[PDB]
Amino acid sequence: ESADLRALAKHLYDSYIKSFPLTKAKARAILTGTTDKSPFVIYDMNSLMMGEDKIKKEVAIRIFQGCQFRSVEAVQEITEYAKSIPGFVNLDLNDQVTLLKYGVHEIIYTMLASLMNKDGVLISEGQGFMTREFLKSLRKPFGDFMEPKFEFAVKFNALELDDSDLAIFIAVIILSGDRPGLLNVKPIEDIQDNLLQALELQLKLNHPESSQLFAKLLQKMTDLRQIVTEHVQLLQVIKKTETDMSLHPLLQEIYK
């Protein structure tokens, strides 16, 4: 019955709204311009300092540290959303951790796209907007830190997916039965099968005129992996040239 799939889709979308304060709908509203949600833009040094005063230690590293914090924040959000996925908490505690460890970043960059356009990205819950040109001008090796993300966002945002779609998709990402070290693989794949069935109906009903979106979308998981890898490298480079820089223990744990 497809009525069981629609019901599953609604459960997931409902938890998605409850687990993420800044949705794509809100982001897009802000990005396309209103008066109350008009963001402050940061494109240079002055505006940066000006922003630290209106939005609420060298520029590059100080900024990068913000990224860390935010990432940790997102993880917490994703972790809580994972629990609402039917069957997920019923799995071996070890596997629950495995799926989270690997799936967390691919989900961070997927949702990050919602906050990006070709010229920049929203920060601090939509309160601010930092230009891609500023980030790209940062000091090596932090200048080439965000470029891969912007590249993906532009390509991915072209699918024109909305929140209700993204919720089933990140559910599928988490429930991947091919993660390194999964003890009990079968029960996991059984859940993804169902999720995939929800995403397939969801997309067809929500994007009737959009040919083979389901396939196009599933392909993007390829781009996501690439993004994660490149990051791990660069991240390992910062480690050596910046031995005086911290790293949240939760993030260090995920990269082993």
Ligand X SMILES: CC/C=C\C/C=C\C/C=C\C/C=C\C=C\[C@H](O)CCCC(=O)O
Examine residue 227 and tell whether it contacts ligand X (CB under 6 A). no
By CB under 6 A, tell whether 235 contacts ligand X: yes
Shorter beta-carbon distance to ligand X: residue 5 or 112: 112
SS3 percent helix, strand, coil of the chain, rounded to 5, is: 65, 5, 30
Least separation in angstroms between CB 167 and ligand X? 19
> What residues have CB less than 8 Å from 33, skipping those under 6 apart?
none
Q: Which residues of 163-172 are buried (b: 16+ CB within 10 A; e: fewer)?
A: bbbbbbbbbb
71 forms part of the interface with ligand X (CB under 6 A):
yes
Distance CA 223, CA 172 (A): 15
Q: Is 27 in the site for ligand X (CB under 6 A)?
A: no
Judge if the upstream peptide bond of residue 141 is cis by omega within 30 degrees of 0: yes
Sheet holding 120-123, edge to edge: 40-42, 128-131, 120-123, 116-117
Q: At what angle do helices 163-174 and 3-19 cross, to 10 degrees?
A: 90
Other C-beta atoms lying within 10 Å of the C-beta of residue 27: 22
Q: What are phi and psi of 245, to 5 degrees?
A: -105, 140
Q: Near ligand X by CB under 6 A, which window of 14-22, 62-70, 150-158, 168-176?
A: 62-70
Comparing every residue's Cβ against ligand X, the nearest one is 66
Tell whether residue 179 is among the known ligand binding residues.
Answer: no
Could you say which of 19, 23, 47, 68 contacts ligand X (CB under 6 A)? 68
Is 6 annotated as belonging to a binding site?
Answer: no
Q: Which amino acid appears at position 188 of this protein?
A: I
Phi, psi angles (nearest 5°) of residue 201: -75, -40
Sign of the dihedral defined by the CA atoms of residues 247, 252, 254, 256, in that order: positive
Question: Could you tell me the smallest distance in angstroms from the CB atom of residue 43 to ligand X?
Answer: 13
For residue 182, the minimal CB distance to ligand X (Å) is 23
CB of 164 to ligand X, least distance (A): 23
- CB closer to ligand X, 189 vs 230: 230
Residue 231 labelled as part of a binding site? yes
Chain centroid to Cα 2, Å, comes to 29
Mark 77-116 with x for binding to ligand X (rule: CB under 6 A) and - for no binding: -------------------------------x---x----
170 binds ligand X (CB under 6 A): no
Question: Closest CB to ligand X among 154 and 201?
Answer: 154
CB of 92 to ligand X, least distance (A): 26
- Pick out the residues of the known binding site for rosiglitazone: 68-71, 105, 231, 255
Binding site for ligand X (CB under 6 A): 63, 66-68, 70-71, 108, 112, 121, 123-124, 130, 235, 251
- Pick out the residues of the known binding site: 68-71, 105, 231, 255
